[PDB]
């Protein structure tokens, strides 16, 4: 089954292609409506694969150097293996002198396509965690924040190095365990510093970055004694917050102390930066922070210069191999639009909320440090991703959390998409859910090898190798075999990645439509000029619907959202795996009522019954809706009566299923309990339903059966 194939391959190799059968001719390659692309999860978890403490074994043809894989033709007699990428024949390294047929190296069994190696030769560098904290916020929020930080400190590895930087009007770089005093270096938040400058003004581990085991007690006390920015805030003014400079100093500090080694710069902000570089809004309360509307009518004088400042910091950090996290909680906007690149370019996180003093933030924050079956963090640092393809395959680029190493070669395409012009990318921070989109081009069995070198949370350097192969289309059945290998879900997401990438770097809908229509005409079924005749196989029938929801989503229709919310939504969409991505675009909906157990139902107004309870899973929100009738039976009180122990199983069935997923998901989703009449019902109402899908479909058919 084509479905079993798609499933088993994503499970084993953490990969999903828009097409599982590729064009064997130039006349087809160029006429591909949806590009051959893959959604790749370099660190996907699976059934405990045995880590290979090896010397991976590389091909001996200078240019190639691919890793020995299951696609390689071996010869246990001649102690030789022929590379599958360049046909170069190799001699087996000494440590393999005794490998036999009835006992061969794991990297050759088709089961271990996608395998991990550990490279042990040089002492491991400790992890580094630098807390960068805003102190311009209400006491309840600050106290809550201080507690979350102290907690995270109790989870760090003994050897990890930690540093603390606090800010408000001035920026303070604390020197921990300085004894009998507690000193820091204060800088004006008014002007930026390079790193050379910083290095000079300030002076393994430094005075500013010490091992947790030696410094933890002192830092806990310091974190506990932190107080509000001392500078008063006059009437009608926002406090002066130097977020831009605080971040440049954090980046600069690590750049001149530990460049090129895993590190985490965690910034906690409680309001917009109000004193550039990086300024997002003035200090007059009477003037609101920019809205999308304000941006479109050129009434946001800070956006561009502010965006420029953070983009530079992002690239400085990403270049030095450091990760930047932004935890932003405030009642008003915080400037995530201008700072997005830091967490987007580096694989850092973006957490948004209303206050640090909520369960939402506290739980999301502690999820950050979730550990595995060995007591180790589920994070990887300084990841280098290199892709090797058959001479017939080229790479247009990638879309997701990464930066280009701008390394050239024959695999690089002229038609670049996203971060292109390279066959190597750097991902400063990644996890088991991190997902990149790789767009390919054809210029049987084509092969692609993904090699990911990263620093494990334990300190070990690791190399993840996933080698995959897909059949070349048979010449006497090209489009027929190709069509059968379509992965509509994967393709819908890959196309959505491109569209969102173009919008966040400016009509994109028109491009989306032209491609939708083209796909309908090439793989559909119909009689010219007869809309009613149009049909799609089981392989393509859901694509139109996914497209409908995507173009109406908050990912493309930004107004009705604050610029910060929009940036948050996209940030998470550009890193997520297939399952979660689909949910973001088209929320799953479950119905609950006495008449049968919970069931999935169409995202339509027709599913909103009065005697039923609905659960909507937006990746960002889990919402429970109580229909008018059940709202009454519930306002009435029948729930308590011992007579209605049934009305209880009902009222809590959705609450039960919510909890489960309301925990596995990293950014903990916001939970909402509303009903017919409630104001929060609006969330379900706007996700439900040109106009409706029926009208959208008719138009698509009217254009599918007409002129090409």
């Amino acid at each position: 089954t084509y479905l079993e194939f798609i499933q088993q391959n994503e499970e084993r190799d953490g990969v999903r292609f828009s097409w599982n059968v590729w064009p064997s001719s130039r006349l087809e390659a160029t006429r591909m409506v949806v590009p051959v692309a893959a959604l790749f999860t370099p660190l996907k978890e699976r059934p405990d694969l045995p880590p290979i403490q090896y010397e991976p074994v590389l091909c001996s043809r200078t240019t190639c150097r691919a890793v020995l894989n299951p696609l390689c033709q071996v010869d246990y007699r001649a102690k030789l293996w022929a590379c599958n990428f360049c046909y170069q024949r190799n001699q087996f390294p000494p440590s393999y002198a005794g490998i036999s047929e009835l006992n061969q190296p794991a990297e050759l069994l088709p089961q271990f396509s996608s395998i991990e190696y550990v490279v042990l030769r040089g002492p491991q560098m400790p992890l580094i965690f630098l807390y960068v904290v805003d102190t311009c916020m209400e006491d309840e929020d600050l106290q809550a924040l201080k507690e979350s930080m102290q907690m995270s400190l109790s989870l760090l590895p003994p050897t990890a190095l930690v540093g603390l930087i606090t800010f408000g009007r001035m920026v303070q770089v604390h020197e921990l365990g300085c004894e009998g005093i507690s000193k820091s270096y204060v800088f004006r938040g008014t002007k930026d510093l390079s790193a050379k400058q910083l290095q000079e003004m300030l002076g393994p581990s430094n005075r500013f970055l010490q091992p947790v085991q030696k410094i933890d007690m002192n830092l806990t006390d310091l974190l506990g004694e932190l107080q509000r920015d001392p500078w008063p805030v006059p009437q009608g003014k926002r406090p002066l917050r130097s977020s831009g400079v605080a971040l440049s100093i954090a980046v600069g500090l690590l750049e001149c102390t530990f460049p090129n080694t895993g590190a985490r710069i965690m910034m906690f902000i409680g309001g917009p930066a109000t004193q550039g570089p990086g300024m997002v809004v003035g200090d007059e309360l009477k003037t609101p922070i920019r809205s999308w509307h304000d941006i479109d009518k050129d009434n946001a004088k800070y956006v561009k210069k502010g965006t420029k400042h953070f983009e530079a910091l992002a690239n400085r950090a990403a270049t030095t191999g450091h990760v930047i996290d932004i935890y932003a909680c405030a009642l008003d906007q915080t400037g995530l639009l201008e700072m997005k690149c830091c967490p987007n370019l580096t694989g850092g996180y973006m957490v948004m909320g209303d206050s640090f003093n909520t369960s939402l933030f506290k739980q999301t924050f502690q999820r950050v440090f979730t550990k595995d079956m060995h007591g180790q963090f589920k994070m990887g640092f300084g990841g280098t991703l290199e892709i090797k393809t058959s001479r017939e395959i080229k790479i247009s680029g990638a879309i997701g959390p990464c930066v280009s190493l701008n390394s050239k070669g024959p695999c690089v395409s002229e038609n670049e998409i996203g971060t292109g012009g390279t066959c190597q990318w750097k991902i400063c921070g990644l996890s088991p859910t991190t997902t990149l989109a790789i767009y390919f081009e054809v210029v049987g069995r084509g092969a692609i090898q993904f090699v990911t070198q990263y620093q494990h949370s334990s300190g070990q350097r690791r190399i993840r190798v996933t080698t995959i192969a897909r059949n070349w289309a048979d010449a006497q059945t090209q489009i027929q075999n190709i069509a059968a290998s379509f992965d509509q879900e994967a393709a819908a997401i890959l196309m959505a990645r491109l569209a969102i990438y173009r919008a966040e770097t400016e009509d994109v809908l028109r491009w989306l439509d032209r491609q939708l229509i083209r796909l309908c005409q090439k793989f559909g079924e119909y009689h010219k000029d007869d809309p009613s005749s149009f049909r799609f196989s089981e392989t393509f029938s859901l694509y139109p619907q996914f497209m409908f929801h995507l173009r109406r989503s908050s990912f493309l229709q930004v107004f009705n959202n604050s610029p910060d919310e929009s940036s948050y939504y996209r940030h998470h969409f550009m890193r997520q795996d297939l399952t979660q991505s689909l949910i973001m675009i088209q929320p799953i909906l479950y119905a609950y009522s006495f008449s049968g157990p919970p069931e999935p139902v169409l995202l339509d107004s027709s599913s909103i019954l009065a005697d039923r309870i609905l659960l909507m899973d937006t990746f960002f929100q889990i919402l429970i809706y109580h229909g008018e009738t059940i709202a009454q039976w519930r306002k009435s009180g029948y729930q308590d009566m011992p007579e209605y122990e049934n009305f209880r199983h009902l009222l809590q069935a959705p609450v039960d299923d919510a909890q489960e997923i309301l925990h596995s998901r990293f950014p903990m989703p916001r939970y909402i309990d509303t009903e017919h009449g409630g104001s929060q019902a609006r969330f379900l109402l706007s996700k439900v339903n040109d106009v409706s899908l029926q009208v959208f479909m008719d138009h698509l058919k009217k254009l599918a059966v007409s002129s090409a």
């Binding site: 509000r228 008063p232 805030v233 006059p234 009437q235 009608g236 406090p239």
Partner: protein, 135 residues
């Protein structure tokens, strides 16, 4: 929405206590001493003067005037609440000795309370007349 606070005996305008911090004071300090000099038993016991970008706020209790200067923007409502806090404290502490002293600023030490009260107002977290007139 900043500072300058002066407390003085109405009769002669004798200064009793005050507080100021710059890092001009010169001009507005004269105007304040001008007011005190003009004030007498027939003066309004609660008033607000407008001096351009600035605004004076004062109250008279037991022959003691409590004046304050600040940017016109500063909430008039808070300026008087500020004056009331000073009054009750001052009258309670020295209210009965005021009519006997003769040296300027004989209660300079009241300097402390003034400033520890001033900060609780300059941190967000009656009659009107152009002062130029009265003078």
């Amino acid at each position: 929405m900043v500072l300058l606070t002066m407390i003085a005996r109405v009769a002669d305008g004798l200064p009793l206590a005050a507080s100021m911090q710059e890092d001009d004071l010169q001009q507005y300090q004269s105007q304040a001493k001008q007011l005190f000099r003009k004030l007498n038993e027939q003066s309004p016991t609660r008033c607000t003067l407008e001096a351009g970008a600035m605004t004076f706020h004062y109250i008279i209790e037991q022959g003691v005037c409590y004046l304050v200067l600040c940017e016109a923007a500063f909430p008039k409502k808070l300026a008087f609440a500020y004056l009331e806090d000073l009054h009750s404290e001052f009258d309670e502490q020295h209210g009965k000795k005021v009519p006997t002293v003769s040296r300027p600023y004989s209660f300079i030490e009241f300097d402390t309370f003034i400033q520890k009260t001033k900060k609780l107002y300059i941190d967000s977290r009656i009659m009107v007349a152009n002062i130029e007139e009265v003078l």
